[PDB]
Amino acid sequence: MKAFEFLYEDFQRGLTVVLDKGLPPKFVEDYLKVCGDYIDFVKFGWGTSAVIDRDVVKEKINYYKDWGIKVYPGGTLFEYAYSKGEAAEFIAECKKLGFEAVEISDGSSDISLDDRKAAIWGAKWAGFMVLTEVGKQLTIDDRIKLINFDLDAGADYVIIEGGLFDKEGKVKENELDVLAKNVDINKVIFEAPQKSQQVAFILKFGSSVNLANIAFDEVISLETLRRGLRGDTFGKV
Amino acid sequence: MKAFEFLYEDFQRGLTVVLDKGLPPKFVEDYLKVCGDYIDFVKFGWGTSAVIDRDVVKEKINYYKDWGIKVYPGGTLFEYAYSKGEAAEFIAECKKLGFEAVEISDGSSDISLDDRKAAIWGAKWAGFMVLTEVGKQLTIDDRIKLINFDLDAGADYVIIEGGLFDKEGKVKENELDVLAKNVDINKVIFEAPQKSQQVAFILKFGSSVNLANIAFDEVISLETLRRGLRGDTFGKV
Amino acid sequence: MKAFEFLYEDFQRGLTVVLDKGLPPKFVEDYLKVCGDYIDFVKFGWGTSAVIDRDVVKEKINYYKDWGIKVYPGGTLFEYAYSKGEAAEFIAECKKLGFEAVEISDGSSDISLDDRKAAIWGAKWAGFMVLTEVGKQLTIDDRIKLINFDLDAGADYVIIEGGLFDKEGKVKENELDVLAKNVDINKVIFEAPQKSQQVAFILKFGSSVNLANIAFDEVISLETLRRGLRGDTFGKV
Amino acid sequence: MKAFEFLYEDFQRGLTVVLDKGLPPKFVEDYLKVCGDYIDFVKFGWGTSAVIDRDVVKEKINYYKDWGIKVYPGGTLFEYAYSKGEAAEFIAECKKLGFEAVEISDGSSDISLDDRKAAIWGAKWAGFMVLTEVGKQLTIDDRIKLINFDLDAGADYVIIEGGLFDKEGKVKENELDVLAKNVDINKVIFEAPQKSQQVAFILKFGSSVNLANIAFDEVISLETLRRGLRGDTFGKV
């Protein structure tokens, strides 16, 4: 039961992906009692999991699994291990630690479409859910090509690196409408670390939009924005 | 200790791959007491493992594992599951049954070089040892391209479909010499189901040659051929 | 439960008759755990049952009965006993040993149509299932006469001696089509000891065709051929 | 043992000084399990220790001491006590609380070079490790004079107030090269509260550079930047 339960009206809620930079284990155990209902995925940011103690990483993953959250290591660590030639050992250690998903990217390295598809099948047949990063010359048509290529290669979701906002910070609605006409947006996730970006995507697509790089203390804020309980979206959703 | 141990002279022994068509479980348990020292891999032929009871398949794999043998399902079962779109569930069931390797082939299907490389990484990152089948227009140079492509993609061994023998059954020694000049033959395995083929490869490359499709009752015959203890190779090795 | 159970598609399976030349008792007990689901009848070949120890013959028959298989002695032993004038003692000993069927033939003897029908009723009223052998001058029309005569006399199945293949080894499809127009092929069984014959009948009549003289180690091979899990019938059935 | 231990390559790591604004005691106890291996010193910021309960300050200092971290009160509290004439009582209370170092500064007060040297000896002979703050007219040569004066007076480290970055945010590399030619940079520490400054110093001097005013939640980020595990320093270190 929520406080003020009589104010609840039911709605379609999109995915939330949370960025964890290194939260303490028993802080995570208590933090999920407030907002574990509103998180779908957690990214351990970039290579941060390769810095932390191995029993601390396992203990944190068990706390997220008790709420049904899927945890994964950021794609920079895959690109690191891939550049060292260690990609099979990276995939094996992910399974021993207990991640349920992996992210494929070429943000710090160059990887061909042949190697990218091979890496996607590599991760699926190893038993992970697969996410990919798109956005790195790229017109909106070139993003549409890469998104469709990753979905046809078998990625479960595509993350748009965040492009979609102009020099002032207003959303480029023509490109965003062209994207929605050419791609199944139910399989797309947008990076929206700033509250103004979260408002712009919610006002464009409604409460069902999928969002990523959400800061751990803004999870409750985002749920109030989806539900119309903050002055930015009050009476608009 | 072997009978007549004083006749033993030590030598470099190549790989043996045995073909199992459906041997009974407690027949396999007793059979390995005679010749388990001389087997490296067992192929469960084509789709035969998809016909047998699941507890019988597990029981057989445990008997081969007690002698350190690596068991795998033949490449036609991969092509079947791949043609149905079930390739990830095929890899998952292989792990649950306890196979330690898989074979990638296109003997009945058509698969591109791009899909073939993606399937090889698929199997490697899932933690299997990977074998591939080559031979299906192909000159000796086209075999050499395909062998090097599968080895560069990361196959642990390449099996040559058996081409290498003429219309009478004599070995095409010029093509076989061109192969040995362009490929690391320590990673190549030759199909040799007939005793005359086993003799031709042993006389060309010595006891260290790797051989496949060996019938279960010819394993002891092959060890006598490698060791010079049968009239075909007597005094020639 | 079969291994890879998710690949199973349900189909109409025809009869399999297996030839036993003298398999050991506890080999049979273990062998049926692999392939007893895919056998309908076992022929003890020619006169081999008259050579073996009487308690060994009973012990083998009980192992086949535990899987619901019907065992019978080959028709050359009936022709032997009939030529000695001992046919009633042969029928009595079959019941004491525990065979559930008998085969009537004239492959080495000469027997009139009158005596043939009298022998068919002889075996039915004694309580056996009756099979007959046809093929010994005979055009396809003369086979069609003999098949209908044996079915009208009351035989449960007619076995075609295997005629149906040319001098190269290709099936004589014109005669085989004329047969299917004149005879109920659900009561016909074809001899097919070679894998090329098994493929030719499966491609002509589908998975539901009835086959005989199957070697004991080829039963799993035949089930993969019926199910399309081997390169000869892959994607054709 | 770290997660992904096989990716570790050994390297020279510089000092990290962390700013604590008032973290809760049992939050600090859990937080050090994640990143206590990557902290050398903790500054209790400005006068914040004089606002907190005396048993809470002791409890926090004991949690930092269990990881070998040296805690100190920020130099504004020394300047406060010095301006009141109470500097000897401030030194006495620091020993009773259990700080292991002190910071000498004139950031808000005016103090002569005579009084500054007397304060450095005051703190050393009382048994503390001594840090000083430099930067307040000053050319890079005048910074060099003050750094050498504090090191000759006996300071264990000198902190550069953070000058070294231009009006756009780019590092003034000409002055930074002149500094490194005149001063032992192993005894210098740079203030770098922003990630762009931390990157600029790591790219100029390598992973061995000493950094200060690191936010408590950015300690794991900084260790990934030193180790090349984040896109800013990926492949550059």
Numbering used by the authors:
A (entry chain 9), B (entry chain 6), C (entry chain w), D (entry chain 4): 1 to 136, 144 to 169, 177 to 251
The authors write:
Here, we develop a general method for designing self-assembling proteins that uses predicted structures of oligomeric proteins from thermophilic organisms as building blocks. We docked these predicted structures in the so-called “I3” architecture by aligning their threefold symmetry axes to the corresponding axes of icosahedral point group symmetry, using the Rosetta SymDofMover to sample the translational and rotational degrees of freedom along this shared axis [Fig. 1C, (27)]. To evaluate the accuracy of our design method at high resolution, we used single-particle cryoelectron microscopy (cryo-EM) to determine the structures of one nanoparticle from each of the successful PDB seeds.
Comparing the experimental cryo-EM structures to the computational design models demonstrated that AF2 structure prediction was quite accurate: The all-atom rmsd for a single monomer of I3-A6, I3-D12, and I3-A7 were 1.3 Å, 1.7 Å, and 1.4 Å, respectively. Aligning two subunits across the designed interfaces revealed that these were designed with high accuracy, yielding alpha-carbon rmsds of 0.7 Å, 1.1 Å, and 1.5 Å, respectively. In each case, the rotameric states of the interdigitated hydrophobic side chains at the designed interfaces corresponded well with the design models, as did the polar residues lining the periphery of the I3-A6 and I3-D12 interfaces. These values are comparable to those obtained from previous computational nanoparticle design campaigns that started from high-resolution crystal structures of the building blocks.
